[PDB]
A paper describes a structure:
This first key step of infection is catalyzed by the virus-encoded trimeric spike (S) protein, which is also a major surface antigen and thus an important target for development of diagnostics, vaccines, and therapeutics. The RBD can adopt two distinct conformations: “up” for a receptor-accessible state and “down” for a receptor-inaccessible state. We have previously identified two structural elements, the FPPR (fusion peptide proximal region) and the 630 loop, which appear to modulate the S protein stability as well as the RBD conformation and thus the receptor accessibility. In this study, we have characterized the full-length S proteins from the B.1.1.7 and B.1.351 variants and determined their structures by cryo–electron microscopy (cryo-EM), providing a structural basis for understanding the molecular mechanisms of the enhanced infectivity of B.1.1.7 and the immune evasion of B.1.351.
3D classification identified five distinct classes for the B.1.1.7 S trimer—representing one closed prefusion conformation, three one-RBD-up conformations, and one two-RBD-up conformation—and two different classes for the B.1.351 trimer, representing a closed conformation and a one-RBD-up conformation. This explains why the B.1.1.7 trimer is more likely than its parental G614 variant to populate the RBD-up conformation, because the FPPRs and 630 loops are structured in the G614 trimer. We superposed the structures of the B.1.1.7 trimer onto the G614 trimer in the closed conformation, aligning them by the S2 structure. An outward rotation of all three S1 subunits in B.1.1.7 leads to a slightly more open conformation. The widened gap in the variant loosens the grip on the 630 loop, accounting for the absence of ordered features in this part of the B.1.1.7 map. Second, S982A (Ser982→Ala) eliminates a hydrogen bond between the central helices of S2 and the carbonyl group of Gly545 in CTD1. In the B.1.1.7 virus, mutations A570D and S982A lead to an outward shift of the CTD1, thereby relaxing the FPPR and 630 loop, which help retain the RBD in its “down” position in the parental strain. The mutations increase the frequency with which the S trimer samples the RBD-up conformation, allowing B.1.1.7 to better present the receptor binding motif (RBM) to ACE2 on the host cells.
Residue numbers in the entry:
A (entry chain C): 923 to 1162
B (entry chain B): 729 to 827, 854 to 1067
C (entry chain A): 1116 to 1162
D (entry chain C): 689 to 728
Write the structure that this text describes.
Amino acid sequence: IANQFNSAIGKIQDSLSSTASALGKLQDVVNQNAQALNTLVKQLSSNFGAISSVLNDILARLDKVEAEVQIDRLITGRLQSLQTYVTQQLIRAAEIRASANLAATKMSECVLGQSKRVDFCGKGYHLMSFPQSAPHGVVFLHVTYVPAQEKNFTTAPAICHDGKAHFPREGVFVSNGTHWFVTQRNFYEPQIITTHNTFVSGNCDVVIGIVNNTVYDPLQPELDSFKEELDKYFKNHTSP
Amino acid sequence: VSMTKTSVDCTMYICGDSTECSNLLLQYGSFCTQLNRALTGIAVEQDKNTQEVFAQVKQIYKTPPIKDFGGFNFSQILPDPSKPSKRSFIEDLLFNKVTKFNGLTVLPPLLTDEMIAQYTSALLAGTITSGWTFGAGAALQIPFAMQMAYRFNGIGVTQNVLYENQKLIANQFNSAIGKIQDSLSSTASALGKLQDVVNQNAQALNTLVKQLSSNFGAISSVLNDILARLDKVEAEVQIDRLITGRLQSLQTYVTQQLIRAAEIRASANLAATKMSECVLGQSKRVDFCGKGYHLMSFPQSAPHGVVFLHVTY
Amino acid sequence: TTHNTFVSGNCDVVIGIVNNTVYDPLQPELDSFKEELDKYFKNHTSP
Amino acid sequence: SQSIIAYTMSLGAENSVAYSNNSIAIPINFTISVTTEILP
Ligand SMILES: *[C@@H]1O[C@H](CO)[C@@H](O[C@@H]2O[C@H](CO)[C@@H](O[C@H]3O[C@H](CO)[C@@H](O)[C@H](O)[C@@H]3O)[C@H](O)[C@H]2NC(C)=O)[C@H](O)[C@H]1NC(C)=O
Ligand SMILES: *[C@@H]1O[C@H](CO)[C@@H](O[C@@H]2O[C@H](CO)[C@@H](O[C@H]3O[C@H](CO)[C@@H](O)[C@H](O)[C@@H]3O)[C@H](O)[C@H]2NC(C)=O)[C@H](O)[C@H]1NC(C)=O
Ligand SMILES: *[C@@H]1O[C@H](CO)[C@@H](O[C@@H]2O[C@H](CO)[C@@H](O[C@H]3O[C@H](CO)[C@@H](O)[C@H](O)[C@@H]3O)[C@H](O)[C@H]2NC(C)=O)[C@H](O)[C@H]1NC(C)=O
Ligand SMILES: *[C@@H]1O[C@H](CO[C@@H]2O[C@@H](C)[C@@H](O)[C@@H](O)[C@@H]2O)[C@@H](O[C@@H]2O[C@H](CO)[C@@H](O)[C@H](O)[C@H]2NC(C)=O)[C@H](O)[C@H]1NC(C)=O
Ligand SMILES: *[C@@H]1O[C@H](CO)[C@@H](O[C@@H]2O[C@H](CO)[C@@H](O)[C@H](O)[C@H]2NC(C)=O)[C@H](O)[C@H]1NC(C)=O
Ligand SMILES: *[C@@H]1O[C@H](CO)[C@@H](O[C@@H]2O[C@H](CO)[C@@H](O)[C@H](O)[C@H]2NC(C)=O)[C@H](O)[C@H]1NC(C)=O
Ligand SMILES: *[C@@H]1O[C@H](CO)[C@@H](O)[C@H](O)[C@H]1NC(C)=O
Ligand SMILES: *[C@@H]1O[C@H](CO)[C@@H](O)[C@H](O)[C@H]1NC(C)=O
Ligand SMILES: *[C@@H]1O[C@H](CO)[C@@H](O)[C@H](O)[C@H]1NC(C)=O
């Protein structure tokens, strides 16, 4: 488990070193804010139907009462260029907020806890996560258990024993085609079907697909091991 | 989950075929591009939204040819192969129930409704044959009554309660999927939240086109009429009015569409979160998958949306 | 105890395992019965 | 020998599941995966 984990942290370095594309969602935000400011500055060069976009060129060339009409064009277009920028940036800020609220939720539920929420902390079942800072962002290294080498088995919902029907306490009944075992749902660890691994409910008539097999009881040998000792006692006590 | 990808040739909207008008629109600089960029950003985000919801499997599971799901009858929510479009009986009710010169165009989604139905088929066949396990890793088959028993055990009800009632639980489930057909056949109103998105986008485009007929204090709203009736140095003052009102009519549309795209995004993130936590898992989050304790959910495709059939104890 | 715990495998593999007893509640419930059983055999030396 | 192709996209590899009324798959082994998720 530690070697698989250490190996996987090794692949994170290789991935984050090798491609440029890995931080694509963070670079895209730096690019949007750069492009919106490039646009906001470019609109200083636009005429808006004045005789020039250079404000001092207007005021050098024209006397006050005429220049007011040219300058008013530039004011009108520039002010619309800011209202466009601020609207775009407010709408963007709401998207970055929604991402920050998600990142804060993942800090709380993935780093400060363990999550039962499927696919909320990457593919697999969540074990833990480690935060790492990025420029304008966060990276979470999610650590997850993934079931790797499946094998098929025959299975049944219950074991029929003494007409009482038995169900698993935890896990599932499985068979290799000769013997029946109880095992945990996400890792093949077979065990003898004991009265401690199972629980009884009702009789065997009702359950669809129930199977006949033995259920063991550890009291059975731990009391027959006193039967033969007790019988030896009685047989020896015929000797006096 | 998404809305209609709309692109506008701004230059055709503001100055439809008039080269002199287009020479005037260049006096406003980048605004003719900035709005195509914004509309392209919305349009790409619809394919993003649709993949975050439906593409939660990189592998396409199929249902077995035999239907021994322990008595549970998925025939109304699994595909019908006999149709040209491989859609489930319930998905055809959903598809039925949601109903030039100006420079506007509608781009197709990257995924046709046939591919959304194929992803939804895979999510559902994964759920029916393998429970939550295809969410975690490779799909592990399990008999559907043993999956339901694990479900029951998740809501804190002991698994003997499934097996001792399995015909009743299947009859209640079959009856309840029965009522889903009856609801989705009978009323028009059940699909209201998808029809409302289709209506708002149609209403915003109706508004955007109607503003082309507005005068903005020019002597006419017809651009070619202004250029026919006036010589260039006078016409430029009338055209600057039409350019100014039209450009403001587009910035109003694109602002409304960005704000509305942020709401469809929020819904697509919720829908993707429900695909993850309701279809690919069992949720202990109360009321997140309808009223009751969550057993499992089945996704269904709808026009520009998703339907989840949540199953609850 | 054997009720508060579960067994799997053997003591060679677990890094940092410790030696202590685990109690069995059946052990007094059977050996209180063994000293009783011994008394019943010893009383049967009196006839 | 290179060119730009155009094609209908595959949604994934197809993979029919080996279902039966009495068959289960269980993992004999696991892999600890570590994956980066990046957020603005
Ligand atoms: C299903 O699982 C069963 C339990 O693991 C397994 O039964 C066991 O099989 C091994 C041999 O493969 C037996 O080992 C014995 O083999 C001979 C017996 O003559 C001796 O030389 C050995 O010392 C050893 O005792 C186990 O005893 C046997 N267990 C039982 C209770 O019978 C099955 O073989 C498995 N079947 C399949 C198809 O996988
Ligand atoms: C699981 O094990 C059960 C016990 O071996 C077995 O049940 C037995 O089934 C037979 C066949 O019906 C019964 O035999 C009786 O059949 C009729 C009455 O039903 C009589 O006319 C016959 O003379 C005969 O007595 C057994 O009585 C019955 N035993 C019990 C305790 O129910 C199941 O059939 C086994 N199932 C499988 C799949 O292995
Ligand atoms: C925990 O308790 C264990 C049982 O007392 C103990 O294991 C014992 O370790 C010793 C030392 O090696 C063994 O003694 C034998 O060592 C070799 C043969 O293995 C011989 O050269 C010696 O002469 C001697 O026979 C015991 O046999 C061994 N017992 C068992 C059952 O393994 C652990 O060492 C204890 N650990 C701690 C930390 O307390
Ligand atoms: C577990 O078993 C399934 C299918 O059951 C087997 O079917 C026969 C082929 C034979 O082996 C029987 O004794 C079994 O009952 C396996 O599914 C097959 O997988 C291969 C690819 O690996 C595929 O080509 C076949 O078409 C599949 N057959 C069916 C009926 O689905 C599955 O691979 C087995 N799992 C493992 C890990 O061995
Ligand atoms: C699963 O449910 C469907 C829908 O109720 C069943 O199909 C109907 O069966 C009756 C009786 O043969 C027909 O009259 C209907 O016209 C069928 N409807 C459809 C849409 O096919 C189907 O039989 C059930 N499956 C099983 C295995 O019981
Ligand atoms: C579980 O999978 C791991 C690999 O992740 C297996 O470990 C390898 O085992 C072989 C021998 O079978 C060794 O040569 C390799 O060096 C091991 N690799 C590592 C990373 O340890 C392991 O054997 C598998 N376990 C079972 C029971 O199948
Ligand atoms: C499984 O299906 C077969 C038919 O394919 C049937 O004969 C058998 O009785 C079923 N078994 C169970 C346990 O339901
Ligand atoms: C039988 O009992 C006597 C004393 O009662 C004892 O010495 C002897 O070892 C016993 N033998 C057996 C085989 O129990
Ligand atoms: C704990 O660490 C010490 C050294 O700091 C070492 O001697 C000891 O064996 C370790 N114990 C366990 C259980 O790993």
